[PDB]
C-alpha cells in the first residue's frame, strides 16, 4: 500500500498548494505533511486503510473548496509580496 | 380506600371530588367535569393534562420520570409544582391534595374555546 | 546555471547546510530523508523549474545527478 | 413514517362493505374523541361462531387505515371471544405506533369491540 | 428520486443570486461588523449597512429604521413585548386576532401571564378582521395592534392601510407582521401608516437565521429590548451581526423589489390553473378563505370525506402541508381554520398547497392529477362518504 | 494587498470544511426541519439531529442537552434571564464576576432593574476570582453563579471544577460562558458539575448567527422561555431551526474535537515565540492577567508609554484590538483591565493579540517586527517617555 | 449590437441547461427567455447597454451558481424521470 | 480614519522639544479628562512677539497626535494674539473629526492656551 | 429518419402545427420566429443530434432544407 499512501499524499500536497486564501493554503499543507508524518510507524492494515479512506476524504473536501476560494478570489495578503 | 381531592378550575373554582385508590386524575377530572384537555389521553405526547399540585402533596407524590419531565418541559406556564395529571395515581397519602389548573396549556385557544371532553 | 538552483533545492528541502549535496549523493542514504520528503523535493524541484515529471521519472530520481540530469534533459 | 404503516395503508387488506341487516353481520361505527378518525368495522360470523369475513372503511390518518386494515385482518379467521382477546397495546406494537398515535390502535380496539357487541345484541 | 417541494409557506429554497452575493463572505470576508480598528470589521461594517439599505429600500423605510434580528419570530418577540414593557406605565391593554401566528399568540399569552390585557379580535367567515370591531375593541390605555398583512396558513389579505389609518387617528401604534407578504405584495410603511413590521429571512428566498423588523423614527416608536449585551443595532438587539446573513437578506430583498410584479403574475396565473383543475374534476372541494382577499401563492382547500395526513401520505411525491390534527405533535387542531368558522371535520381535510418563484406549469399538473386520482380513492375508501351517499348525514357515531 | 488578521478572540474564520458541510444544505435541502410530512422535513430534522449530537460529543454531554440558540449572547441570556424568573419565587440572588462578558453584565444588571439582587465578585491582580470569596458571597437565597471559562479579554482561566463543586455542594445553579473555551481546552459538563454552558458558533471557526446552550438534564434545571412561539428546541427556543448554520456548528465541533491537542501545542509553542520576541527587544512591557493559567491563544499585552488606538494606527498592516477608551464608541475604558488592578495609563496602552488555527509563523515573526519598530517610534514621540526618561 | 446580444443571449440559455437542479434550471430558462423577448422593442441605446451590463453580471453569477451545484448535487425530482 | 488625520499621523510636523529654560519659550502640558491622551506643546517667540517655531510630543490616539501637530503647523508664523483665535472647532472641521473625537481638538486648543499663557507668564 | 426528426423539431420549436413545415419554408418569412426563436431552435437541432454547430453554420441555418443539409452532412 505504500505506492497508494505516496500518491495520495503526492495528490492531496498538490491540491492543497492551489488554495487561493493564505491561511488555508498553509494551514492545509502544514496539517497533511504533520498528519503523514505523525502516521509512519502504523502497522496495523485496519489502521491504515481507516486512515487512507479518511484521507481521500479530505482531499475531496479540498477539491471542492479549492475550486470555489478560486471562483471567489479576494486580493493577497501584505506579506505573500 | 377513598381518597378526596380538590380540583381548582381556571376561573378559581374549588371543586371538591371523591376519589379511589388507583384512580388516575385526568380520567378522575373528566368523570366530574373538570376542564382538563388530556388531548393524548395519557400517551405522554401532548402535555395538556398540566396541573399544579399543592406544596403539603407534591413531595408525596412518586418523583416524575425522564418522559414526564421532557413533555414538561413543552407545557406553558410551568412552576416547581408542575406534573403531568396523567402520569398522576391516587394513593392514601394523597388525602387532601389539591390540583390548580393552569390558565393555558401547549394546545392554542386564545378564542375561548373548550375542547369536548375526552 | 541549474545545477547550482538543483542543489539550493536539495538543501533547503533537506535542511543540509548547503554542502553535503554532491553529485553522487542519494536522497535517503547519504541524506536525510524518507518517501514523503523525496515527494517533497520532487514538487519543489517542479515548481522552481517549470514542468510536470511523470511517475516513473520522479521514482528515477532518486539522487542529485539524476536530477540534474532530469532538469538539463527537460 | 414506519414501513409497516405505510406498507398497511400502500395496500389495505379487506377494504369494503358488508350486508348490516343480514342476522351474521355486526357492525362497529366509531370514532377518535380528540380528533377526528372515524372507523366503520364489520364482521361475517358463520354458524359455528368463527369469523369468516372481516372488512372496515376508515376517515382518518395513515396509521389509522394501517391499524384499521390489521384489525380486520387478524380477527379473520378467530372466533368471538378470542377477537374479544385483542388489545390496543398489541396492534401498537405491532405497528410501532409512536405515542401520539395510539389513538388509532385505541379506535380500532373499540371498533372490533363495537362490531362484536353489536352482533351479540342481534344474535 | 425526490418529491416535488410546493411548501413554500413553510420555508423557500435559497435564490442563486442570493447565494452567490453570501459566498464571498464566508469564504473572504469573515471580519467582524463591530470591530472598528481593522479592514476586515470596515469592509464587514460596509456590507452590512449595503443590506440595510437594501431592505429599507424594498419596504419604502429609511435605512435607519432597521434592525436585523435572527427571524421574524424575533422580530415579533421584540415588537409585541418591547413596545408593551416600554409603554407599561400608562398603556396595559394589547389587541391582536384569532388567526395570528404562534409566535404572536404566545407573546400576547406571556404578555396576559405579565398582567397585560389582551383582546383577541374575531374574523368573518372570509377570514378578514372587522374595521367596526377593531375601532369598538380600541381602549384610551390601548397600547399595540397587532395584524398580520397576509395568513400563512389560508393566504388572505387583511386591510392594512385601513387599520394603520384607524391606529394613526386613534394614537394606537399599529404592528403588522408580513413575513409571508414581503417581496410578494406591494408594501409601503408610510402609506400604510405602519409603526412596526416583521420581515423573515427564509420566506423571501433568503437564507434562514436571519430577519428584520421596521421600526418607525418619526414619530418615534420605543421598544424595551429582550437581548441584553453590548447595544448592537441601535441598543435594540445586541449580539454580533451575521454579515453573512444579513447580506444575503438585503440581496433577497433587492431580488424580490426587482421581481415582484413578473412573480405576481406568474403566481396568479399558476393558481388559478390549480384551483380551476382541481374544481373542475373533484366534486365537494371547497377554498378557506375569500377569493377577492387572497393572495394567490397560497392555497388551502378542504376535500370533503378524505382526511388531511391520509392524503398526504397518499401524496408522498409531493411535499405539502395539512390542517389537520393527526399532523400535530400534540394533537392541536387548526385554530386558523376554527376562526373562520370551518365545520370540524372539513377542518381534518384541508391541505395547503404553495406555489412560488420556482414551481413550475409541469409540477402543478402532476400535483392536480396525483390529487385527483389519490381523492377519488379515499373517498371510495370513506366511510363518511359512503354514509352521505346512503343518507345518514353523519347523525350518529360511538366516538366512545 | 490586505492585512494580517490576528484577532481571532473577535470572531474566526469559517473552516473549509464547515462550509463544504454547510453548502449541501444551502443548495439542495432547504427544506424546514419542523415539517413533519415530507422528505425535505425529515431530511433537515436528521441534519439538525446529526449536529446535535456532534456538539453533545464534544462537550461530553447527551444530545438532548443541547438547545440551539443564534449565539452565546442569546445563550447568557437564556441561561440567566430564564433560571432568575424561574426560580424567583424562593431565590432572588445571582452570583458572577466583575470580568464577564458584557451580555452577562448587562443581564445581570437588568435583572437588578426587575427587584433581584446581583453580587459581582472581584478577582485578583491574577485575574482569577477567590473561591472563599465565592463561597462567603453564596447566601441561601441564591439562584445561580456564573462564571466564564476564558476571558475574551486577557484570557484568563477560572477554576471551574472547583467552582462546580462548591456549587454542587451549596445545592446552586452554576452557569458558564466557554465561548472562548469550547474546541480549544478539555470541557466535560459531568466532570466540572456545570448546569448551564454558553457556545458560540464563530468563535470555533463556525458561521455566524449560530449557537448553543447546554441545559442539564439529570438533574432537572428549568428555565423561563424568553422568546415566545411554536414550541420548538424542547419548548426553550421558539422559531424555525437554521438547518445550514445547525451543521456547520456540528462539523465546527467536530473538527476542533479531531484537532484540539494539535492546535493547543501548536498554539502554544507560537505563544512563547511571540511572547519571548516581544519582551526580549522591547522594555517596559508587560502580560495582563496571570501565565499558569492562561490559554496561550489571547495576548494581552500593555506598551508602557504608549497609546493603543496609536500603536493600533501604526499597525496597519495587522488586524488587531486593543483596551483603550478611545477605540470605544462611548469613550469607554477597559472594565476589565480596571477590575484586574491596571492602572490607568497602562490599561489606555493595552494590545489583545491573537493566534489561532491559521496563525502561521510568518505572520508572528512580521508582526513581533512592526510591533518593535512602531513601540520605538511612539516612545520616541511620547511626552510620557521624555518625562521617564528625564526621572520624573 | 444585434449580434453581440444574440451570442449573449445563445450562452447565458446554454449555461443554464447546465443547471444541475430543475427549479433553478427551468427557472433560469424561462426567466431568460421571457426577460429578452420583453426587451425586443427597446430603442435607446444607453437602456441597450444596461441592460447587456446586467445580461453579463447575471451571465457570471449563473456560472458560479451552475458549477457550484454541480459541485454539490443530488438525486432528480420524481417528474424528470 | 479620515485621509487627513491619516497623513497628519504618518508624517507628524515638528516633532521634539525645545529648551524649558529660554525665556522666550512657553511650555503647556495639558491632559484629556474622559481618556489618557496628553499633549506637551512648546513655542518659540521673538522680538517682534512672533512664533516661529513649535515642536510637540504626545501620548494619545491617532486623531489627538493629527490635532497636535496641525496646532503646531497653525500657530507657527503666527503672534500671541492670532494664535489664540484659534478654536477647537477649525482644528475638528479641518481634521473632519467624528463627534466622538472632539475631544482631540479640545486638548490641542488647551495646549495652545497653556502654552502662551506660560510664555506671556515668563515675560 | 433524420428529416423527419428535424421536421418534428422544428414544428415543436415553433408551433405550427407540423403542416407547414416544407422544404423550402423559412424560419422567419414563412414561419412565424424571429432571431430569438431562431437560436433556440437551432439550440434543440444541437439537443437531439448531438453536436455543436458553430456559428459559421449556424448563422447559414435559416430553413428546413438547411437544417436538414447540415445535419445529414455532420
Ligand atoms: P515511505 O517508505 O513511502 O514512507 C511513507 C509511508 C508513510 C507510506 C510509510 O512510512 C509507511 O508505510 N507507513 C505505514 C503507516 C502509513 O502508511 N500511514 C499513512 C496513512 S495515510 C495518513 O496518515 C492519513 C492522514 C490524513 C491527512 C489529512 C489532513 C488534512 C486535513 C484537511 C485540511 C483542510
Ligand atoms: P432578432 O429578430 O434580430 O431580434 C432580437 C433582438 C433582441 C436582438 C432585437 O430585437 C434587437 O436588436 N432589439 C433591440 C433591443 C435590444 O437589443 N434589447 C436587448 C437587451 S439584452 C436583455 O434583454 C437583457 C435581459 C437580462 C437577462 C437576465 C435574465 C435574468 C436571469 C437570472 C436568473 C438566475
Ligand atoms: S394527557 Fe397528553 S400528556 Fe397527559
Ligand atoms: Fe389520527
Ligand atoms: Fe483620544
Known amino acids: ?81 | 380506600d377513598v381518597v378526596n381531592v380538590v380540583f381548582v378550575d381556571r376561573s378559581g373554582q374549588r371543586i371538591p371530588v371523591s376519589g379511589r385508590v388507583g384512580d388516575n386524575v385526568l380520567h378522575l377530572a373528566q368523570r366530574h367535569g373538570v376542564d382538563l384537555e388530556g388531548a393524548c389521553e395519557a400517551s405522554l405526547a401532548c402535555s395538556t393534562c398540566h396541573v399544579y399540585v399543592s406544596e403539603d402533596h407534591l413531595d408525596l407524590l412518586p418523583p416524575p420520570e425522564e418522559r414526564e419531565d421532557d413533555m414538561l418541559d413543552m407545557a406553558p406556564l410551568l412552576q416547581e409544582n408542575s406534573r403531568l395529571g396523567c402520569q398522576i395515581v391516587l394513593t392514601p397519602e394523597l388525602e387532601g391534595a389539591e390540583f390548580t389548573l393552569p390558565k393555558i396549556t401547549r394546545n392554542f385557544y386564545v378564542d375561548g374555546h373548550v375542547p369536548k371532553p375526552h | 546555471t541549474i545545477e547550482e538552483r538543483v542543489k539550493k533545492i536539495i538543501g533547503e528541502q533537506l535542511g543540509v547546510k548547503q554542502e553535503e549535496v554532491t553529485n553522487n549523493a542519494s536522497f535517503v542514504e547519504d541524506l536525510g530523508a524518507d518517501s514523503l520528503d523525496t515527494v517533497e523535493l520532487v514538487m519543489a524541484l517542479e515548481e522552481e523549474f517549470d514542468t510536470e515529471i511523470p511517475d516513473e521519472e520522479a521514482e528515477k530520481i532518486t539522487t542529485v545527478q539524476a536530477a540534474i540530469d532530469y532538469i538539463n534533459g527537460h | 413514517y414506519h414501513k409497516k404503516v405505510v406498507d398497511h395503508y400502500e395496500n389495505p387488506r379487506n377494504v369494503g362493505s358488508l350486508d348490516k341487516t343480514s342476522k351474521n353481520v355486526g357492525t362497529g361505527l366509531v370514532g377518535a374523541p380528540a380528533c377526528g378518525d372515524v372507523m366503520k368495522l364489520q364482521i361475517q360470523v358463520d354458524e359455528k361462531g368463527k369469523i369468516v369475513d372481516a372488512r372496515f372503511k376508515t376517515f382518518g390518518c395513515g396509521s389509522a387505515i394501517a391499524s384499521s386494515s390489521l384489525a380486520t385482518e387478524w380477527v379473520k379467521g378467530k372466533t368471538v371471544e378470542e377477537a374479544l382477546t385483542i388489545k390496543n397495546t398489541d396492534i401498537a406494537k405491532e405497528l410501532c405506533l409512536p405515542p401520539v398515535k395510539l389513538h388509532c390502535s385505541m379506535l380500532a380496539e373499540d371498533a372490533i369491540k363495537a362490531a362484536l357487541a353489536d352482533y351479540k345484541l342481534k344474535q | 428520486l425526490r418529491p416535488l417541494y410546493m411548501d413554500v409557506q413553510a420555508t423557500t429554497p435559497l435564490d442563486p443570486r442570493v447565494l452567490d452575493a453570501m459566498l464571498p463572505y464566508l469564504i473572504n470576508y469573515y471580519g467582524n461588523p463591530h470591530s472598528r480598528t481593522h479592514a476586515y470589521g470596515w469592509e464587514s461594517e460596509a456590507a452590512m449597512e449595503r443590506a440595510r439599505q437594501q431592505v429599507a429600500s424594498l419596504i419604502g423605510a429609511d435605512p435607519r429604521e432597521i434592525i436585523f434580528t435572527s427571524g421574524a419570530t424575533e422580530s415579533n418577540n421584540i415588537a409585541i413585548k418591547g413596545v408593551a414593557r416600554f409603554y407599561r406605565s400608562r398603556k396595559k391593554h394589547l389587541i391582536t386576532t384569532q388567526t395570528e401566528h404562534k409566535c404572536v399568540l404566545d407573546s400576547c399569552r406571556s404578555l396576559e401571564a405579565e398582567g397585560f390585557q389582551v383582546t383577541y379580535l374575531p374574523v368573518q367567515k372570509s377570514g378578514i378582521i372587522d374595521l367596526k370591531e377593531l375601532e369598538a375593541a380600541i381602549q384610551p390605555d390601548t397600547s399595540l395592534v397587532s395584524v398580520m398583512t397576509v395568513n400563512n396558513e389560508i393566504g388572505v389579505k387583511q386591510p392594512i392601510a385601513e387599520i394603520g389609518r384607524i391606529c394613526s387617528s386613534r394614537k394606537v401604534y399599529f404592528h403588522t407582521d408580513a413575513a409571508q407578504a414581503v417581496g410578494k405584495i406591494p408594501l409601503d410603511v408610510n402609506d400604510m401608516k405602519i409603526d412596526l413590521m416583521s420581515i423573515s429571512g427564509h420566506k423571501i428566498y433568503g437564507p434562514k437565521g436571519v430577519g428584520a423588523i421596521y421600526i418607525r423614527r418619526r414619530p418615534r416608536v420605543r421598544v424595551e429590548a429582550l437581548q441584553s449585551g453590548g447595544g448592537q443595532e441601535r441598543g435594540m438587539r445586541s449580539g454580533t451581526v451575521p454579515t453573512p446573513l444579513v447580506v444575503g437578506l438585503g440581496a433577497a430583498c433587492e431580488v424580490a423589489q426587482q421581481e415582484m410584479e413578473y412573480d405576481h403574475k406568474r403566481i396568479s396565473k399558476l393558481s388559478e390553473r390549480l384551483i380551476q383543475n382541481i374544481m373542475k374534476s373533484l366534486p365537494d372541494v371547497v377554498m378557506n378563505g375569500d377569493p377577492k382577499h387572497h393572495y394567490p401563492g397560497c392555497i388551502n382547500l378542504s376535500f370533503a370525506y378524505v382526511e388531511g395526513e391520509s392524503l398526504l401520505m397518499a401524496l408522498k411525491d409531493v411535499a405539502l402541508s395539512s390542517g389537520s390534527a393527526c399532523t400535530s405533535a400534540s394533537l392541536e387542531p387548526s385554530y386558523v381554520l376554527r376562526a373562520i368558522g370551518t365545520d370540524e371535520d372539513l377542518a381534518h381535510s384541508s391541505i395547503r398547497f404553495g406555489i412560488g418563484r420556482f414551481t413550475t406549469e409541469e409540477e402543478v399538473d402532476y400535483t392536480v392529477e396525483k390529487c385527483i386520482q389519490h381523492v377519488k380513492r379515499l373517498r371510495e375508501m370513506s366511510p363518511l362518504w359512503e354514509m352521505v351517499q346512503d343518507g345518514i348525514d353523519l347523525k350518529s357515531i360511538k366516538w366512545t
Open chain 1, 1 to 81: 500500500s505504500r505506492a497508494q499512501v505516496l500518491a495520495l499524499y503526492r495528490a492531496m500536497l498538490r491540491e492543497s498548494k492551489r488554495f487561493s486564501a493564505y491561511n488555508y493554503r498553509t494551514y492545509a499543507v502544514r496539517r497533511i505533511r504533520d498528519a503523514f508524518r505523525e502516521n509512519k510507524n502504523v502497522k496495523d492494515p485496519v489502521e491504515i486503510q481507516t486512515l487512507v479512506n479518511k484521507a481521500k476524504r479530505d482531499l475531496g473536501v479540498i477539491r471542492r473548496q479549492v475550486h470555489i476560494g478560486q471562483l471567489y478570489s479576494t486580493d493577497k495578503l501584505i506579506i505573500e509580496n
